[PDB]
């Protein structure tokens, strides 16, 4: 009933965070801020009323069912997770994390078939590596015999590298041994600002 977006914002100090919440029901909407290792704090209530202690850099707006929290001139204390709320309902949350600017860098893409050692176990894991890219935003889609896959992959992302300011991501596709041997072509498709078109790395099961 409360749809908060986006999931993650990667921003530099001085920039502005724009966080939106779609509702479908009737009631006053609130926004909370949770700093790392701290209790959540009331930022906004009743759509746009700033709580006590909240600077005017925070502002709430509403267009139809869409509520927006905008945080201008980001400071250190502003980073953390934000939640919208209506009665007992809360949004999924938006993580606003510190990003250090650098030039755009395309990811190097690598795909890994399941090990023979693992295929003895009865399960198969296919790994896709997105190495050293910027900015953080990247889409990974799995295809098996050119069919879009959903619900059988998990991703993990590294913290921004302290030296070259890049990110890395790994996506793991997990299938049963039986379901794996049913198909031939395994592919991960990567879209990123640093690529003029989406890049696909793939292998044909069996052949080396």
């Amino acid at each position: 009933v409360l749809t908060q977006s986006p999931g993650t914002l990667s921003l530099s100090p001085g920039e502005t965070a724009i966080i939106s919440c779609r509702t479908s029901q009737y009631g006053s909407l609130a926004w909370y801020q949770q700093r790392p290792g701290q209790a959540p704090r009331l930022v906004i209530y009743s759509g746009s009323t700033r709580a006590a202690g909240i600077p005017d850099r925070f502002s709430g707006s509403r267009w139809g069912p869409d509520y927006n929290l905008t945080i201008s001139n980001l400071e250190s204390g502003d980073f953390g997770v934000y939640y919208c709320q209506q009665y007992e309902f809360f949004g999924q949350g938006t993580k606003v994390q510190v990003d250090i600017k650098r030039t755009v860098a395309a990811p190097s893409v690598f795909i890994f078939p399941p090990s023979d050692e693992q295929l003895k176990s009865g399960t198969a894991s296919v790994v896709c590596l997105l190495n050293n890219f910027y900015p953080r935003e990247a889409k990974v889609q799995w295809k098996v015999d050119n069919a879009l896959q959903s619900g059988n992959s998990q991703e993990s992302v590294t913290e921004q590298d302290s030296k070259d300011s890049t990110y890395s991501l790994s996506s793991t596709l997990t299938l049963s041994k039986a379901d794996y041997e049913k198909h031939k072509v395994y592919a991960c498709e990567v879209t990123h600002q640093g690529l003029s078109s989406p890049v696909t790395k793939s292998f044909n099961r069996g052949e080396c």
Partner: protein, 342 residues
């Protein structure tokens, strides 16, 4: 020309000087005699907004009933604030009488006359009066007793149905008697009788009204989730004795879906250690009087709470509520508001 304002109301009643009954004695010193010829002026082409949940008449009635109980139903022991107060607690004559609330000079009461008025919003037929109708200060939980009935259909009342923290008042258009009794010769054991045929039909109508407010979802009743006995059970005072009646049978979802027809008998018990609704603490009273203790009341309303939570089910669950006695006064004062003439 007038505006919404608040003031110090005075009270009127038909209390008798020869009565030793508690409410009568209080009203004798606190109220004036009623007007034999009350005046009501029907206002034409006048639409006014009302809000029963923000009516300060309610706050003054609350002060009066507290003062009445404090000056009368004195406990043998008053356990509050860590300290212990021991007073004299003689048996009394207890029977609530109707009480009228009226405005002083410069102020007038506006009365909503829309038959389907739900408590908030605009009202088409508005009249002008100096006093309210006679309201009995009946203190109870879960069930509203001896009150006024809704004119046309059953009316659902809430400050905001979408808010599970807000109490729901169900206003009945047909009263259903409840007959509670403590027979002579365990002296603290009692019971209430209810005609299961009338109740289950009324209850069925309540669920159909609730369907209208909740998108035709399945309406389910459940016993309270927890709390003190005063609210997990039907709590009320009869003849000076505090009754605690179990209402699990009054909310039988099976009987509103055969065999349920007949007479419902609720298990009751008269307690001596009670939690005071004045928000004070615990009070200890004397053992119940001998003889047949009995009082017959009209169930005219129901206090409900609605279940919440991050769910997606197609049923709404309601449970008998109460505990905030100010809500009892809201259920009768809902159609009145005080305005000031210039």
């Amino acid at each position: 020309v007038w505006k919404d304002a608040d003031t110090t109301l005075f009270c009127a009643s038909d209390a008798k000087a020869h009565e030793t009954e508690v409410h009568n004695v209080w009203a004798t010193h606190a109220c004036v005699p009623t007007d034999p010829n009350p005046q009501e002026i029907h206002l034409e082409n006048v639409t006014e907004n009302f809000n029963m949940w923000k009516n300060n008449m309610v706050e003054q009635m609350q002060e009066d009933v507290i003062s009445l109980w404090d000056q009368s139903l004195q406990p043998c022991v008053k356990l509050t604030g860590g300290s212990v107060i021991k007073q004299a607690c003689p048996k009394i004559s207890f029977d609530p009488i109707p009480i009228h609330y009226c405005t002083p000079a410069g102020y007038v009461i506006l009365k909503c006359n829309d038959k389907n008025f739900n408590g908030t919003g605009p009202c088409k037929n508005v009249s002008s009066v100096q006093c309210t109708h006679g309201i009995k200060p009946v203190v109870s939980t879960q069930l509203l007793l001896n009150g006024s009935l809704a004119e046309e259909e059953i009316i659902i009342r809430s400050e905001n149905l979408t808010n599970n923290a807000k109490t729901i008042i169900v206003h009945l258009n047909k009263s259903v008697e409840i007959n509670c009794t403590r027979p002579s010769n365990d002296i603290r054991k009692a019971y209430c009788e209810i005609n299961g045929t009338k109740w289950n039909k009324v209850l069925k109508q309540v669920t159909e009204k609730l369907k209208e407010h909740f998108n035709n979802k399945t309406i389910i009743f459940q016993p309270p989730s927890g709390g003190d006995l005063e609210i997990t059970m039907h709590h009320f005072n009869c003849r000076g004795e505090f009754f605690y009646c179990n209402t699990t049978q009054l909310f039988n979802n099976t009987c509103i879906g055969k065999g349920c027809n007949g007479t419902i008998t609720l298990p009751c018990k008269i307690k001596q250690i009670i939690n005071m609704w004045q928000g004070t603490g615990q009070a200890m009273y004397a053992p119940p009087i001998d003889g047949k203790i009995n009082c017959v009341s009209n169930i005219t309303g129901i206090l409900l709470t609605r279940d919440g939570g991050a769910n997606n089910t197609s049923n709404e669950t309601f449970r008998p509520g109460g505990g905030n006695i100010k809500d009892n006064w809201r259920s009768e004062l809902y159609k009145y508001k005080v305005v000031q003439i210039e």
